[PDB]
Symmetry: C3
Subunit: 230 residues, 3 copies
């Protein structure tokens, strides 16, 4: 309770934990192989986030980085979360549209570059260089957003309407929520330091629960996750 | 030789190295694609363990963690081993039964959570919180054990008898040996400290060689690893 | 500019960045799923290397390792690069020949052992033991080279001539360039220290740009990356 942001770390831990349990229960019983892949992906995402929220809450996932002459509290565990959960979210989208394997590779690899350069920026001790990593990471994010909108152009032919509809909704959820993360980091504790860590943590908690549990609720309620069967 | 547990680290290095060489030789010549996947998986497992045993033996894979007011010797290299070798062992089981891809994802991701939360527990400086990570990791292990027993329920129909027989044996080997690891950690150097590090290292060496080389000997001697062919 | 090797780190950053941009543009428009996988793999390789070259240039990817009684500058970011880019290069080769999945596993796992034991050697504080890790890593490299020459022996039957021709060329490029890396490390800053870090950095920059951008130019100009189509 000693860090003011504890309350949002606690709330994020609880909501990710409850979302995980909900999705775990919800997928109990499903047999359809296509649906099993979406439940597995979609349940792992908040499970991983639960563990990394808890590590921040307990202090394990926090480190001090000197930059600006100051000792700056940097929650590194966010990058260990996102390293796994953001490619998993992209895989859910990619599987929905039956993406080609080359496209999945491009997406997962650009996402790794996005998170790994964000982690390097988050831990860089020369203040000005932190924003160079932010820019490179943002370029990788823009590439991902580009592929999500313009990289499935051969798939439209042979896409079930309900898959098309659930994919468009989740793609729009993804583009809006993910695009807010570079802005929060830029103005927050890792970047310019104009928004305090307390509020930054709240913002990422709202984004994360929305991008993982809210995304997952929309996907897992959809018929698009089942193969078409008589 | 300065740490009493060196002898078990040396013995573990040698047995993993010899098991690797044996499996490498044994799979020389196999053409069958199914069998090649099992030899590859099963040979990599003790090869990786050989390197991490050697890193503990040479001291690289040891760190001191303050907790309990004391400086506690924690062999972190075990988690770098298990991060790769325990999903590989699960993949051998999963391939045997032709598991659905969603099930393999669930298994590999729960296993990553199990090892990563065990690593966080192993390095946590607040003593009481180490057991919170142990509990979460144990929950993930129990999920894996649950899936190995109740998650292949559509596969029984179309399973060759020899695959069914080798899978049941290896599944039983896996459930018994893996379940001992949380107990050893709980009573050993990472947990309550009731069993000294010397004996703990012996116990994990016996478990590891059994779970990797003993498992691999049973699998690789089986006809279940070959596709059925005239 | 304070470290004499900065100029090769700068040149390597620029050439990897320009190679990435070139391959990104070059693959704009390709529809063929086979070709998309090769463009994705082959574009990610210099993109990742660009980020790790930049991290060395900016100092983030450098650490000091005590060994020999001295504080030795070790660029660890090379291992974070190679951890991802060397399996990706192997995947390009493997996909060219339609390798069996067991063979791809063997290659990617031996490559992980090669890079992870090279990283352990690079950070080991007992000088003599650094060469033990070098030897183990070299054994893994020799295994990979062995598989590239003798592990596709069932694939020769059903291999298009242009795939066979591009694969032989890239395989020869790979064996020659990769084999130089253990020699550079052995005589350079990480090993015996007979070649200064400045020259070592130049050597790895020439190898890396050749093994990534030069390799990629040969592959991506080939018809072998397209499925055979009327
Ligand atoms: C967390 C617990 C419920 C585990 C402990 C219980 C044990 C066994 C009993 C539960 C068991 C009956 C599970 C029932 C579900 C069935 C199949 C489950 O999963 C379905 C899919 C694919 O269809 O993958 C879904 C993928 C999933 C991945 C599993 C990860 C989990 C691991 C534990 C830590 C997490 C965090 C949640 C904490 C909260 C509090
Ligand atoms: C959860 C999500 C929806 C997040 C989406 C991303 C997003 C763009 C981030 C917005 C964060 C913001 C609301 C938080 C405000 C912090 C702030 C009030 C700090 C207060 O305390 C200190 C002061 C000076 O006294 O600094 C003052 C700080 C300021 C400079 C605050 C700047 C915020 C903006 C000017 C709002 C931009 C408009 C957007 C909605 C873009 C569309
Ligand atoms: C360790 C050495 C034998 C390597 C050095 C030798 C070189 C080349 C000569 C050996 C060569 C003829 C290998 C013969 C086997 C053939 C094909 C091998 O592998 C078969 C399968 C799939 O069928 O994958 C199997 C997957 C396997 C993965 C390879 C990992 C190894 C890498 C080296 C370090 C290890 C640790 C063992 C140390 C002991 C001492
Ligand atoms: C290789 C594997 C098969 C491992 C399987 C997992 C397993 C449950 C772990 C057992 C480990 C155990 C045999 C090691 C004993 C350590 C011990 C003798 C320490 C000696 O020295 C100090 C003392 C006090 O003087 O502490 C005293 C320490 C004690 C409290 C020891 C506690 C051990 C048990 C009471 C045995 C439980 C029974 C099981 C076989 C479960 C079935
Ligand atoms: C680097 C920039 C061009 C990104 C910013 C731009 C944004 C959107 C505009 C560009 C956009 C029109 C891309 C056009 C290409 C199309 C499809 C691209 O990719 C094709 C394949 C599979 O066929 O994967 C190919 C796999 C590839 C992986 C993408 C990784 C990149 C990420 C950014 C950092 C890098 C480093 C390069 C820096 C230099 C300077
Ligand atoms: C980019 C690539 C092609 C690299 C391929 C791998 C390769 C084998 C590495 C060669 C590196 C080499 C040319 C660099 C030379 C460093 C060197 C001149 C150092 C100079 O300064 C200090 C001195 C003493 O005054 O040490 C003296 C240092 C010496 C002992 C230098 C040793 C180099 C050799 C004797 C050359 C071997 C022949 C090969 C071409 C193998 C075929
Ligand atoms: C899915 C859910 C039930 C998760 C609920 C949210 C939760 C994890 C975080 C909320 C913290 C909350 C209790 C706030 C008040 C603090 C308080 C207790 C007293 C203050 O008092 C103080 C004074 O400084 C702090 O106490 C010590 C530390 C604790 C407060 C933190 C404990 C860790 C957690 C509560 C989480 C435990 C994880 C488990 C789910 C493990 C089981 C795994 C498995 C079976 C799948
Ligand atoms: C597959 C096998 C042959 C492995 C055999 C077991 C072994 C790796 C560990 C046993 C240690 C043992 C010799 C005990 C006595 C110590 C002693 C030498 C003297 C004591 O004297 C002392 C005094 O404190 C310590 O010596 C210095 C360190 C060494 C003892 C340790 C050296 C490392 C290893 C012996 C392993 C080397 C790895 C290789 C396989 C590399 C090749 C890779 C490739 C070709 C695939
Ligand atoms: C693809 C290319 C355009 C890459 C070009 C090469 C380059 C990255 C490295 C060359 C350094 C060079 C300018 C040498 C002179 C130094 C100098 C400026 C003055 C010396 O003056 C000094 C005194 O000590 C140092 O300056 C401070 C640091 C900088 C010199 C380094 C800045 C980082 C880089 C220049 C790279 C930026 C990365 C971007 C591509 C981000 C955008 C991502 C996205 C849109 C895809
Ligand atoms: C968020 C992101 C930036 C992260 C992206 C990925 C990331 C984790 C990068 C990792 C690269 C690298 C380790 C960097 C080190 C930095 C540093 C300063 C020191 C680190 O930290 C230290 C300091 O004490 C220890 O590291 C050395 C040991 C290793 C970390 C573990 C060794 C592993 C092996 C030798 C075993 C072989 C593994 C394989 C077989 C894997 C293949 C799987 C297969 C079987 C299919
Ligand atoms: C046992 C477990 C807990 C481990 C589970 C996974 C694990 C390794 C978690 C890693 C997350 C994270 C790095 C945590 C950092 C903690 C910390 C305090 C600081 C670390 O350690 C430090 C301290 O000096 C350095 O880290 C920063 C640099 C990075 C480690 C490496 C950067 C990688 C990239 C920028 C390149 C892009 C990579 C991708 C392209 C990968 C995608 C593959 C593709 C091409 C298909
Ligand atoms: C170049 C090579 C040697 C590297 C090869 C791989 C490598 C990165 C090895 C990593 C092992 C290990 C982390 C070693 C730690 C060393 C040390 C001294 C301390 C480190 O560094 C520290 C010091 O502060 C922090 O580490 C602990 C936290 C973790 C690093 C991150 C935890 C991750 C999780 C708990 C979440 C679960 C992840 C999974 C779900 C992944 C599965 C994917 C799925 C969903 C499909
Ligand atoms: C589950 C959490 C999700 C969906 C997180 C998304 C994170 C991002 C899109 C992060 C992007 C970043 C940048 C583009 C620039 C650097 C800072 C980051 C890593 C916050
Ligand atoms: C090759 C080595 C094998 C099979 C290792 C298995 C390791 C485990 C099943 C570890 C489990 C753990 C817990 C469930 C709780 C926390 C402590 C661990 C990581 C030892
Ligand atoms: C893109 C960069 C490439 C192709 C790098 C290749 C790196 C190697 C083949 C590294 C090999 C090493 C050894 C065999 C011994 C230990 C030192 C290393 C890691 C340099």
């Amino acid at each position: 309770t000693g860090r003011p942001e504890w309350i949002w770390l606690a709330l994020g831990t609880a909501l990710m934990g409850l979302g995980t349990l909900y999705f775990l229960v919800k997928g109990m019983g499903v047999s359809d192989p296509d649906a099993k892949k979406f439940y597995a992906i979609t349940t792992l995402v908040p499970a991983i986030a639960f563990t990394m929220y808890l590590s921040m809450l307990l202090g394990y996932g926090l480190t001090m980085v000197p930059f600006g002459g100051e000792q700056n509290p940097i929650y590194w565990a966010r990058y260990a979360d996102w390293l796994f959960t953001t490619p998993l979210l992209l895989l859910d989208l990619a599987l929905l549209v039956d993406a080609d394997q080359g496209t999945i590779l491009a997406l997962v690899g650009a996402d790794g570059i996005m998170i790994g350069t964000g982690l390097v920026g988050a831990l860089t001790k020369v203040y000005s260089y932190r924003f160079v990593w932010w820019a490179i990471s943002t370029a990788a994010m823009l590439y991902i957003l580009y592929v999500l909108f313009f990289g499935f152009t051969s798939k439209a032919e042979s896409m079930r309407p309900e898959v098309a509809s659930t994919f468009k909704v989740l793609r729009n959820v993804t583009v809006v929520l993910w695009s807010a993360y570079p802005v929060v980091w830029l103005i927050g504790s890792e970047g310019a330091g104009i928004v305090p860590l307390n509020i930054e943590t709240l913002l990422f908690m709202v984004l994360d629960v929305s991008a993982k549990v809210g995304f997952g609720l929309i996907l897992l309620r959809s018929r698009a996750i089942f193969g078409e069967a008589e």
